[PDB]
Amino acid sequence: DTERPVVNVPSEITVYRGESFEYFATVTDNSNAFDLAKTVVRWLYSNQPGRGTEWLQYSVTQVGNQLKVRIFGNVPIDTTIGDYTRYVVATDAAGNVNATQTEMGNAAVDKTSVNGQFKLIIR
Numbered sequence: 713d714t715e716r717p718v719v720n721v722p723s724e725i726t727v728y729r730g731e732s733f734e735y736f737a738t739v740t741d742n743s744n745a746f747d748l749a750k751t752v753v754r755w756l757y758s759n760q761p762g763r764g765t766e767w768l769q770y771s772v773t774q775v776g777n778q779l780k781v782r783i784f785g786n787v788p789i790d791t792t793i794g795d796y797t798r799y800v801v802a803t804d805a806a807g808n809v810n811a812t813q814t815e816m817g818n819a820a821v822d823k824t825s826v827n828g829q830f831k832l833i834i835r
């Protein structure tokens with residue numbers, strides 16, 4: 713397996729101050745096999761949910777040949793509204809990833825996107 717996994721995540725997901733939310737991403741791979749421990753939802757700079765979105769939670773569950781990545785949490789009532797770019801990163805059993813931190817950063821400079829990138833919109 714040299715072929716990377718593919719995340720399907722909505723390009724925008726909208727959450728609301730004071731409310732709980734739940735959205736999903738799904739993941740396929742040519743090998744149908746994954747490293748779930750290395751499948752995460754994170755911001756650019758580190759494998760963390762990110763400043764201003766520390767309450768962004770996720771879980772990863774395999775069902776058949778797909779991963780189901782639940783993206784969920786409770787938005788604090790006093791969170792800053794606006795847009796937050798975040799990433800679903802998946803890893804196949806062979807260690808291929810859909811996007812690396814370096815690919816994410818280069819896309820950010822160039823005003824573009826990588827597979828698994830999404831916009832978290834807080835209202």
Ligand SMILES: CC(=O)N[C@@H]1[C@@H](O[C@@H]2O[C@H](CO)[C@H](O)[C@H](O[C@]3(C(=O)O)C[C@H](O)[C@@H](NC(C)=O)[C@H]([C@H](O)[C@H](O)CO)O3)[C@H]2O)[C@@H](O)[C@@H](CO)O[C@@H]1O
Pocket residue numbers: 755756762763764765792793794795796797798817818820821
């Ligand atoms: C601080 C800085 O300019 N660092 C750049 C770095 O820039 C970040 O790149 C991100 C890529 O995921 C985003 O483009 C960040 O911008 C936004 C975002 O997440 O979309 C803009 C939003 O308007 C802003 N939201 C609010 C409510 O202010 C968010 C938010 O501050 C952050 O997500 C943190 O929660 O930020 C952008 O800041 C990137 O361009 C790299 C490339 O190497 O270079 C510097 O590190």
Ligand SMILES: [Mg+2]
Pocket residue numbers: 713714715716717741742743804806808
């Ligand atoms: Mg693969």
